[PDB]
Enzyme design. Structure first.
Site, PDB file in Angstrom:
ATOM      1  N   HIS A  14       0.785  -1.264   0.000  1.00  0.00           N
ATOM      2  CA  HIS A  14       0.000   0.000   0.000  1.00  0.00           C
ATOM      3  C   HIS A  14       0.806   1.298   0.000  1.00  0.00           C
ATOM      4  O   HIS A  14       0.140   2.337   0.018  1.00  0.00           O
ATOM      5  CB  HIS A  14      -0.922   0.034   1.227  1.00  0.00           C
ATOM      6  CG  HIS A  14      -1.961  -1.028   1.221  1.00  0.00           C
ATOM      7  ND1 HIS A  14      -2.976  -1.050   0.295  1.00  0.00           N
ATOM      8  CD2 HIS A  14      -2.179  -2.077   2.036  1.00  0.00           C
ATOM      9  CE1 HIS A  14      -3.728  -2.103   0.502  1.00  0.00           C
ATOM     10  NE2 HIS A  14      -3.270  -2.739   1.565  1.00  0.00           N
ATOM     11  N   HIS A 114      -1.879  -4.984   7.632  1.00  0.00           N
ATOM     12  CA  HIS A 114      -2.973  -5.552   6.801  1.00  0.00           C
ATOM     13  C   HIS A 114      -2.943  -7.071   7.017  1.00  0.00           C
ATOM     14  O   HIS A 114      -1.863  -7.672   6.863  1.00  0.00           O
ATOM     15  CB  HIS A 114      -2.839  -5.143   5.326  1.00  0.00           C
ATOM     16  CG  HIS A 114      -1.753  -5.877   4.612  1.00  0.00           C
ATOM     17  ND1 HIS A 114      -1.984  -7.064   3.944  1.00  0.00           N
ATOM     18  CD2 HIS A 114      -0.431  -5.627   4.487  1.00  0.00           C
ATOM     19  CE1 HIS A 114      -0.853  -7.501   3.424  1.00  0.00           C
ATOM     20  NE2 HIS A 114       0.111  -6.640   3.743  1.00  0.00           N
TER      21      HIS A 114
END
Length: 125
Positions: A14, A114
């Site tokens: 990300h 995550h």
């Protein structure tokens, strides 16, 4: 500082200061090649910032919401790669879009994380 491998995983999935809408094909291929069955991930959001700016969301730069979710207090430039076709690599097709949004991430102490990279960060505002 100490290594949190889920933080390194978060940055790889990300955080890319040089990401653009035109780079969705190459960047998603990278993510898809590591997914069981190489299924086309339906969406992935990239933050155009340095790790320190994103880690800060967990240590003074974010609003605690619910279920370990933290919303950044400042907006970020993001690139969203969205699936338009395909079930698996290499038949995946993506459309890239740019936006400026507060991001919603999971924090494990001082570390953005995550779990399973089968989902994506959130955007709001």
């Amino acid at each position: 500082m100490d290594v949190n491998q889920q933080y390194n995983h978060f940055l790889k999935q990300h955080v890319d200061g040089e990401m653009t809408t035109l780079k969705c094909k190459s960047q998603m291929e990278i993510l898809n090649l590591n997914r069981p069955d190489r299924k086309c991930k339906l969406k992935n959001t990239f933050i155009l910032a340095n790790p320190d700016q994103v880690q800060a969301i967990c240590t003074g730069g974010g609003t605690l919401k619910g279920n370990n979710l933290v919303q950044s207090n400042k907006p970020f430039s993001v690139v969203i790669c969205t699936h338009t076709g395909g079930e698996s690599h290499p038949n995946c097709t993506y459309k890239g879009s740019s936006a400026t949004k507060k991001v919603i991430i999971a924090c494990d102490g001082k570390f953005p994380v995550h779990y399973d990279g089968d989902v994506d960060i959130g955007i709001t505002d």
